[PDB]
Ligand SMILES: COc1ccccc1[C@H](NC(=O)OC(C)(C)C)C(=O)N1CCC[C@H](C(N)=O)C1
């Protein structure tokens with residue numbers, strides 16, 4: 001679990017969005033596993049606007065942060081789950097790092113700000129949904 005809070009927006013994994021997120025929907029994209037909802041309070045986070053390929057992510061299943069080298073956002077095949085059919089997930093970055101069911105929502109950060117959130121994983125891999133291209137989150 002986890003979310004990014006920037007301005008009057010809350011960014012979460014679309015498969016973990018609540019009834020309240022959907023009732024305050026701003027934008028969602030199933031192909032990216034992202035959903036953004038509106039908030040009444042001002043958020044605590046800031047978004048990176050960069051091309052970093054290194055950073056640090058929070059791993060809830062270890063209560064620890066780990067450094068990672070990750071691939072640029074791209075279209076990556078993701079196996080079926082209860083949440084989605086087998087499909088290509090877009091804007092996904094992969095890295096070698098621990099993740100397991102329940103780690104979605106952990107933030108990946110570089111020196112410039114928030115890069116994205118955990119969205120997939122498996123067998124010593126961790127995948128992050130990028131948010132750096134969502135320029136409108138900043139206004
Ligand atoms: C962080 O996700 C990890 C990490 C390691 C191993 C497995 C997983 C997840 N698998 C998982 O939860 O499987 C269950 C439901 C328990 C059968 C995973 O990769 N998902 C599930 C949630 C939706 C994700 C997506 N963006 O399509 C893909």
Ligand SMILES: [Zn+2]
Nearest residue numbers: 050052110112
């Ligand atoms: Zn950066």
